[PDB]
Nucleic acid binder design. Structure first.
Ligand SMILES: [Mn+2]
Length: 693
DNA sequence: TGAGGTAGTAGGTTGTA
DNA sequence: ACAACCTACTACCTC
């Protein structure tokens, strides 16, 4: 069983290629018109960069643009400029070959291929993206397969068959090259703000899951979810065909294996989790084990009347469900008690309450103070506009009053009641220990258990409970997570603390996540590092030895500040970049049955960059997405950092379902989103605090 | 919004002799 | 302008 990556490397080197270089007199969009006219006249693969143009063959038709210098020169490998220009020229040459010999259309950002299937007047188009990099005087080409949607009809087809042009109808200028989103008739829809009009014979409605009909959506989504074998066979077939007509570079007969690409293979193993002993899996420990750090939780109930008015379910059913939750929690060493403050607000929370939420909620703070709200709001009120129950609920409770809250809708309660009816229950549940035990016992064999436990986990983590930690220690003693999000000109920073080599404190940094600009200032980073050091010293009574910073995306911060700061306290550190969507794919090919598969905890390593497989999705779900790890600094071996990254992904204490990313980046992204929408507020403390999810 | 996974749509932020 | 990220939204399936 061999290991395959979606890449290849060129036998020729960056300094073994003869190129023609034309330099024009002395703006990053320069000499683009000259290059386009040159392409139009001399029909050759050409590329530009700033004010220089490079090709593989001499240019005959000058088109009146006289160059300053002409050369048959090689490239200075030490100059990144000429490396980028050669990469652009190779990319353009590949695109030109595909267009001339394989009939592909460069649309948007990808080369659209032939259609694969039409689903009731919906065309599905294959597409591929190409990338060229120069890695230590070697040329690596990577590629990624994807899909595109289309409606096969213009506006004329509908307008001939009656219908009405809606002001809010979504149409695009479906054509070649660029694409824009805005009885002859004229439509004057704005592109973004500029006024445009057309003949309505070429504008076509957009094909998106938002607007497609439910019958088409199922099949279209089913089509774009292929297995690993089909996906990578399709990816490799077209690239082999492209190779068969390319002459400017040559490759090995089988250039897709990791051996040809200079990668080394690592097989990580699943860790163990600690609840009160050592458990192989999280599910086994949570099923029949006591929590790592239990305690006492106060819960308050928010019940709206429509939940009974339009759905024939009573508040007594809600209290039976809550009693079941309480008994399950007490079975694991967690004591939850219902507050009795729900007496002055009996019968409240009607439709008028939801329609005047912004004015009839200020008096609810003393009712739910120092508790955990378990809200049972209707999904219609949460989702439908002019009410915005979820947004206002979060933005008030967690946004301003720092009160944790967990929301449940009618689908969960109807599923619970349907299971009860199936099992012969609903006669009487609350205040009956034997009936509660029977309900808990029958909950085990159903998948709905994962729902119930998830709810409990959501209550636990927001209440200061630490469900489990790592059984074994890691090579780093301290983990920091940083993420940045930009929405509508507003920048939100998410910061995250993991205090201890076993986990042992998953916490959010008590710092404001709203940035005055688009960049993280030096003061914020200094405060984050110093506060995390203080937190570790408080928790363990000793200073840490090593700290690893995880960054989502690319490191755009001041490294000199980080070392000035941790030179004084004398802790070694690393800076690591975690990249989602690397636009590559990993597999193991088995030639006995000719199948591509994936194995969780697989690592491909090259230099200071690695690809990690952290999930095991099912065939109908799709194919696993690799993560990209990049080590900026060189304090410890790359293997140890990859191990820490893989091990921190098993600390998803908010759910029973395994998550792809480590907690450091996952929870930091969630926190950045929460500050983007203004639904969280800093809270100092020393316990497990995740006031989101 | 029980949670996670993955895969389409349209836009936004960098930094580049 | 180009390249390599990021975000939001929708959808489905799995537990
Ligand atoms: Mn949640």
């Amino acid at each position: 069983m061999e290991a395959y990556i979606t890449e290849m490397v060129s036998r020729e080197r960056a300094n073994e290629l003869e190129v023609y270089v034309y330099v024009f007199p002395r703006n990053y969009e320069g000499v683009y018109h000259i290059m386009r006219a040159w392409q139009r006249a001399n029909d050759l693969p050409l590329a530009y960069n700033q004010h220089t143009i490079m090709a593989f063959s001499p240019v005959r038709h000058m088109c009146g643009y006289t160059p300053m210098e002409t050369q048959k020169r090689h490239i200075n490998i030490d100059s990144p400029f000429e490396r980028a220009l050669l990469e652009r020229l190779i990319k353009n040459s590949l695109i030109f070959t595909a267009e001339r010999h394989l009939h592909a259309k460069r649309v948007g950002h990808a080369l659209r291929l032939n259609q694969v299937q039409q689903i009731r007047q919906v065309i599905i188009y294959e597409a591929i993206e190409l990338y060229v990099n120069i890695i230590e005087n070697r040329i690596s080409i990577g590629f990624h397969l994807t899909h595109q949607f289309e409606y096969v009809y213009t506006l004329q087809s509908m307008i001939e068959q009656g219908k009405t042009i809606r002001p809010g109808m979504r149409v695009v200028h479906s054509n070649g090259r660029q694409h824009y989103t805005y009885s002859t008739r004229v439509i004057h829809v704005r592109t973004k703000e500029q006024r445009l009009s057309y003949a309505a014979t070429l504008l076509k409605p957009l094909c998106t899951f938002e607007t497609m009909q439910p019958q088409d959506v199922l099949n279209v989504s089913k089509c774009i979810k292929l297995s690993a074998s089909k996906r990578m066979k399709c990816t490799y077939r077209w690239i082999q065909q492209l190779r068969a007509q390319y002459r400017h570079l040559t490759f090995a007969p089988n250039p897709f294996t990791i051996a040809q690409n200079g990668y080394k293979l690592d097989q990580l193993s699943t860790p163990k989790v600690h609840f009160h002993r050592d458990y192989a899996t999280v599910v086994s420990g949570m099923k029949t084990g006591k929590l790592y750090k239990g305690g006492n939780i106060k819960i308050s109930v928010l019940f709206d009347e429509d939940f009974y008015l339009k759905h024939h379910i009573t508040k007594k059913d809600i209290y039976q469900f809550i009693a079941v939750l309480q008994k399950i929690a007490i079975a694991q060493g967690v004591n939850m008690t219902i507050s009795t403050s729900t007496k002055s607000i009996t019968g409240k929370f009607t439709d008028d309450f939801f329609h005047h939420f912004t004015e009839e909620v200020e008096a609810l703070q003393p009712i739910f103070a120092q508790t955990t709200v378990l809200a049972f709001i209707t999904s219609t009120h949460l989702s439908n506009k002019k009410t915005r129950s979820y947004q206002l609920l979060k933005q008030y409770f967690g946004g301003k009053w720092d009160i944790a809250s967990q929301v449940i809708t009618e689908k969960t309660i109807e599923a619970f009641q349907k299971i009860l009816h199936k099992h012969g229950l609903k006669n009487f549940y609350p205040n009956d220990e034997q009936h509660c035990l029977r309900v808990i016992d029958v909950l085990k064999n159903e998948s709905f258990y994962y729902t119930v436990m998830n709810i409990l986990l959501g209550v636990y983590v927001k209440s200061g409970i630490q469900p489990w930690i790592l059984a074994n220690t890691t090579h780093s003693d301290c983990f920091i997570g940083i993420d940045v999000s930009h929405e509508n000109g507003n920048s939100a920073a998410g910061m995250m603390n993991v205090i201890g080599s076993q986990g042992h404190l998953i916490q959010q940094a008590p710092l404001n996540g709203i940035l005055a600009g688009e960049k993280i200032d030096d003061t914020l980073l200094a405060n984050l590092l110093k506060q995390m050091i203080k937190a570790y010293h408080t928790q363990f009574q000793r200073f840490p030895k090593h700290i690893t910073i995880h960054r989502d995306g690319f490191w755009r911060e001041h490294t000199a500040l980080v070392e000035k700061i941790m030179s004084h306290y004398e802790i070694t550190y690393d800076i690591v970049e975690i990249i989602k969507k690397p636009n590559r794919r990993m597999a193991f090919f088995n030639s006995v049955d000719n199948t591509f598969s994936t194995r969780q905890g697989t690592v491909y390593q090259r230099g200071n960059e690695a690809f990690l497989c952290a999930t095991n999705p099912q065939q109908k779900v799709g194919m696993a997405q690799p993560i990209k790890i990049h080590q900026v600094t060189k304090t410890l071996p790359f293997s140890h950092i990859i191990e820490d990254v893989y091990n921190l992904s098993f600390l998803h204490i908010h759910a029973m379902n395994k998550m792809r990313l480590p907690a450091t980046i996952h929870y930091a992204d969630l926190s950045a989103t929460a500050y983007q929408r203004g639904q969280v507020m800093p809270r100092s403390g020393n316990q497990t605090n995740l006031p989101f999810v």
